[PDB]
Amino acid sequence: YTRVVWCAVGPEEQKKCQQWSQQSGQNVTCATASTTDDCIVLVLKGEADALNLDGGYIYTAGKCGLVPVLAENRKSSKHSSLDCVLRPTEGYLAVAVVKKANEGLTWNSLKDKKSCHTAVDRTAGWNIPMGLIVNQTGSCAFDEFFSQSCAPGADPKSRLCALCAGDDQGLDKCVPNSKEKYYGYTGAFRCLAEDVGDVAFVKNDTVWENTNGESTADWAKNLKREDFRLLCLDGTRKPVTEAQSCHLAVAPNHAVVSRSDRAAHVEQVLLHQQALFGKNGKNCPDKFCLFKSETKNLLFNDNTECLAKLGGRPTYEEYLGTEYVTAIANLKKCSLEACAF
Numbered sequence: 001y002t003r004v005v006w007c008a009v010g011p012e013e014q015k016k017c018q019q020w021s022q023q024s025g026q027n028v029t030c031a032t033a034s035t036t037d038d039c040i041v042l043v044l045k046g047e048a049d050a051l052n053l054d055g056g057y058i059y060t061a062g063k064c065g066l067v068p069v070l071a072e073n074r075k076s077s078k079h080s081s082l083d084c085v086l087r088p089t090e091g092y093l094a095v096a097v098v099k100k101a102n103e104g105l106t107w108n109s110l111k112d113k114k115s116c117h118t119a120v121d122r123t124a125g126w127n128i129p130m131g132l133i134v135n136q137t138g139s140c141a142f143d144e145f146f147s148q149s150c151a152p153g154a155d156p157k158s159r160l161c162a163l164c165a166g167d168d169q170g171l172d173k174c175v176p177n178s179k180e181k182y183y184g185y186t187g188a189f190r191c192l193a194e195d196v197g198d199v200a201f202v203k204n205d206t207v208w209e210n211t212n213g214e215s216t217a218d219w220a221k222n223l224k225r226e227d228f229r230l231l232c233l234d235g236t237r238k239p240v241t242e243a244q245s246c247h248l249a250v251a252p253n254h255a256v257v258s259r260s261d262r263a264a265h266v267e268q269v270l271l272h273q274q275a276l277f278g279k280n281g282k283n284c285p286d287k288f289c290l291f292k293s294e295t296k297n298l299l300f301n302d303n304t305e306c307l308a309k310l311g312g313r314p315t316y317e318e319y320l321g322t323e324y325v326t327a328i329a330n331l332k333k334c335s336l337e338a339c340a341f
């Protein structure tokens, strides 16, 4: 009857997907690709049905005619009465984080310092910070601003990949999937924590989830929040508790995309799947939890409370908002109607 094919990016997501596939009685199955771009192509071809994406990729996917189905929703103070599935999403804060110990480093002295990015083309790790850097720089030269970086998905042999480490044994350097040690929110923050870079571009949640005992990963277990600072755009430095006054931008939540002709079908099965393995699901802690992967953010961010319905039936532009959509257009003149494929 109603069977959905999920697209996993890399071997670790593949493994989580296989687990979810087993436990769902094959109501969901898995396709695997090496990168997000490749997963998008599988969906266009019709060989995969769906995957969850950061806003940067929702933009790529959108030009290709894919559509947002459901969005990640995390815990909230305000909007509290409403059920998670119906509650509007709040977005996330993209911030630039540094070590307190690295004094006199401000937004205005980042020139030729070392940077850690989640990946190329992602919202907090790339589009926002580079969008800003290009704009206040006049130059589309973003690859020469930092002396060295880890920016997964850039040319392996460039300075933008210099700080990337690859895997266990040094392979897959700078691949934009979790084989790369410094990939994604967790990896970029690890890049800073281990003093590989001077600055990481992540979101506010990442700092709080890998400090003060929240993570039990060994590179993060001794980390303290007071040891970091946020860099604000006004040239000041603030404690991490101040993200609401010291952020680069507010980002649209990650969301599930699918081909438009499959949207309804994909929506139905996942609402059912989340009842079963979601945050309150018939079986989260006993058999399987869709929203956990021990801080690795596999398939979905681990802080996800549920996947929310989008009311207003957004096109991908409305979903990303005009604000962010122009930020991307502008950045992309550097490196108007298209679809990468």
Ligand SMILES: *[C@@H]1O[C@H](CO)[C@@H](O[C@@H]2O[C@H](CO)[C@@H](O[C@H]3O[C@H](CO)[C@@H](O[C@@H]4O[C@H](CO)[C@@H](O[C@@H]5O[C@H](CO)[C@@H](O)[C@H](O)[C@@H]5O)[C@H](O)[C@@H]4O)[C@H](O)[C@@H]3O)[C@H](O)[C@H]2NC(C)=O)[C@H](O)[C@H]1NC(C)=O
Pocket (backbone or CB within 6 Å): 075, 076, 077, 093, 204, 205, 206, 208, 209, 214, 241, 242, 243, 244
């Ligand atoms: C940056 O990111 C970090 C990490 O995401 C954010 O911090 C996280 O924020 C969440 C919620 O925003 C926080 O949740 C904890 O909060 C309390 C602590 O015990 C727990 O339960 C509480 O429950 C009650 C009711 O459910 C409620 O209090 C009530 O408030 C009303 C009205 O104000 C009042 O009448 C009474 O006082 C009520 O009791 C609270 O809302 C609260 O939820 C939660 O279950 C949970 O433990 C996370 O702990 C926190 N994450 C971490 C790891 O620290 C941060 O907000 C982001 N900042 C910015 C700037 O956006």
Ligand SMILES: *[C@@H]1O[C@H](CO)[C@@H](O[C@H]2O[C@H](CO)[C@@H](O[C@H]3O[C@H](CO[C@@H]4O[C@H](CO)[C@@H](O)[C@H](O)[C@@H]4O)[C@@H](O)[C@H](O)[C@@H]3O)[C@H](O)[C@H]2NC(C)=O)[C@H](O)[C@H]1NC(C)=O
Pocket (backbone or CB within 6 Å): 127, 128, 130, 131, 132, 135, 322, 323, 326, 327, 330
């Ligand atoms: C890099 O550099 C460019 C240079 O501007 C910048 O591009 C864009 O900057 C503006 C921000 O989006 C954009 O202005 C448009 O937005 C206007 C706002 O709409 C108004 O809001 C009110 C408030 O509630 C509403 O009532 C109502 O919707 C109202 O219209 C809108 O009026 C117009 O569409 C404006 O054009 C500007 O057009 C755009 N400029 C260019 C060159 O495209 C990028 O954002 C910069 N990049 C980064 C990362 O900052």
Ligand SMILES: *[C@@H]1O[C@H](CO)[C@@H](O[C@@H]2O[C@H](CO)[C@@H](O)[C@H](O)[C@H]2NC(C)=O)[C@H](O)[C@H]1NC(C)=O
Pocket (backbone or CB within 6 Å): 001, 023, 024, 025, 027, 272, 273, 276
């Ligand atoms: C796989 O598909 C369906 C999703 O609803 C589930 O089986 C359904 O169970 C209900 C109630 O017993 C029936 O009304 C449906 O008709 C059943 N589906 C069909 C068409 O056979 C089943 O739970 C799902 N598997 C899991 C574990 O996710």
Ligand SMILES: Nc1ncnc2c1ncn2[C@@H]1O[C@H](CO)[C@@H](O)[C@H]1O
Pocket (backbone or CB within 6 Å): 089, 090, 091, 250, 251, 252, 253, 318, 319, 320, 321, 324
């Ligand atoms: N509190 C907020 N302030 C400003 N913009 C927001 C906020 N919440 C969500 N957004 C934006 O709404 C857009 C989706 O309509 C997203 O791009 C997101 O950036």
Ligand SMILES: [Fe+3]
Pocket (backbone or CB within 6 Å): 054, 055, 122, 123, 124, 251, 254
């Ligand atoms: Fe993101």
Ligand SMILES: [Zn+2]
Pocket (backbone or CB within 6 Å): 247, 249, 250
């Ligand atoms: Zn703001």
Ligand SMILES: [Zn+2]
Pocket (backbone or CB within 6 Å): 312, 313, 314, 315, 318
């Ligand atoms: Zn509309």
